[PDB]
């Protein structure tokens, strides 16, 4: 593996995306599931998830690790702490970049869970998972013995084949926790060493992109009046439909899709 496979995935960040069923209600999950592909034969599925796999929060390879964005902070968990199930528990074969190779039974949905500190993070999406038998005997669980037949399965290799997905410039993500309230005056304190575009509509429109340490906007009385978008735009993100789009030329490269469907017996 080395860093040849992760050369383009070390320029990317996990993102927080909307999940329709997340433990309680619909929220913005760190493990929102983008797509589930189950066109292989022996119950192997390839998930695309907002979180990232194979490398740690710092950006260095760690063997079996899921790093997820949590309110702007990339955090880590071992891959054995993550649970997957469609109608019965799945088994995670591996994970590379945004993608996860797992072995799942058939189900009408798929659910991914993990508990980090005290709360349980879950994302359940209504993507049908299909189990496709090989040959002319319609089994549901692969047999212990028989005869070998050719089949297509999602391979356990993350090598660079011809398939690619785009990496784009992340859009500015709004953070209302930055805007605090001193005595009858809003104050924006961006994260340490990071800019924050303050877009504000009190008496007199305010567009204060370049704030780095603190800034008090005494014209405003209440926090809800106006917003402080968090500008990072150093790590590139997948072109997800559950994220805002950054203006201008946005495409920045190509990410190869691992675990592609391949011939075997």
């Amino acid at each position, epitope marked *: 593996s080395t860093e040849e496979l992760f050369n383009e995935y070390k320029l990317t960040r996990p993102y927080m995306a909307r999940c329709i069923r997340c433990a309680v209600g619909s929220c913005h999950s760190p493990i929102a599931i983008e797509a589930v592909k189950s066109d292989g034969h022996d119950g192997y599925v390839r998930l695309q998830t907002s979180s990232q796999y194979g490398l740690d929060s710092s950006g260095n390879l760690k063997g079996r690790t899921m790093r997820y964005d949590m309110h702007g902070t990339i955090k880590e968990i071992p891959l054995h702490q993550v649970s997957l199930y469609t109608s019965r528990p799945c088994h995670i074969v591996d994970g590379h970049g945004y993608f996860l190779l797992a072995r799942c039974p058939a189900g009408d949905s798929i659910t991914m869970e993990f508990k980090k500190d005290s709360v349980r993070h879950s994302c359940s999406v209504p993507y049908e998972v299909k189990f496709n038998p090989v040959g002319r005997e319609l089994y549901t669980h692969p047999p212990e013995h028989g005869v070998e037949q050719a089949c297509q399965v999602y391979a356990h290799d993350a090598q660079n084949r011809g398939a690619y997905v785009e990496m784009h410039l992340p859009g500015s993500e709004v953070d209302s926790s930055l805007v605090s309230l001193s*005595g009858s*005056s809003v104050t924006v304190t961006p994260p340490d060493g990071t800019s924050a575009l303050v877009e504000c509509e009190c008496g*007199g429109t305010k567009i204060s992109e*370049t704030i780095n*340490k603190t*800034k008090q906007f*005494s*014209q405003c009385t209440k926090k809800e009046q106006c917003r402080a978008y968090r500008l990072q735009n150093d790590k590139w993100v997948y072109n997800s439909d559950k994220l805002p789009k950054a203006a201008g030329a946005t495409l920045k490269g190509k990410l190869h899709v691992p675990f592609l469907l391949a011939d075997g017996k």
Partner: antibody
Amino acid sequence: QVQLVQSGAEVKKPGASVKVSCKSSGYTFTNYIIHWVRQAPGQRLEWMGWINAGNGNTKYSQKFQGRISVTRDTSASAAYMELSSLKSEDTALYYCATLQMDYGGNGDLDYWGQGTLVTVSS
Amino acid sequence: YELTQPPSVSVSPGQTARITCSGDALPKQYVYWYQQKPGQAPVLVIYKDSERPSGIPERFSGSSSGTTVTLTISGVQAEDDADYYCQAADSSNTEYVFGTGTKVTVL
């Protein structure tokens, strides 16, 4: 434009209390803080405190306790700074600080007043 | 808590000049450079720690490195002589502190 008008220069014997008014207008005066700053002739500017004119909240310097007392009224839209127990060293020029521009807050204070001069009779 | 600043500097006309200000809580605070002409009230020359207001001559510039901030004047003329103060706040973000002031000398 924005105008800040203070009272004329006057002389008080040390030990009394000096009253300086500061009328202000020209912007969204609902929430703007007015700073009182004292400057000795040819010396450093010294920030004494600020007053939130719209709300009425006040803040004073660390070494300005009790001797300083600022206040305002809604009708006249003017600060009413009071400084009791004048001394010889109190001879200085006093300025009001507020911002004309449209960002507000710390540091940004564009237009100043003409100031009031306080001294001791010769 | 106090923002140290040199007493005065001397730079010949048509030559850039530096004014340096320092503080303990400076890297997490914004410097406001104020110029004061003797006889009347000061006028803001630099705000937001990096960029001048509208109408200020373009020769003024400012930058911050670590715990220091520098104000640079490119090609000083005779009308640039005045009190130059660095303004910031206390480490608790509650007390406003002005600089000592630099007497720039232009010939």
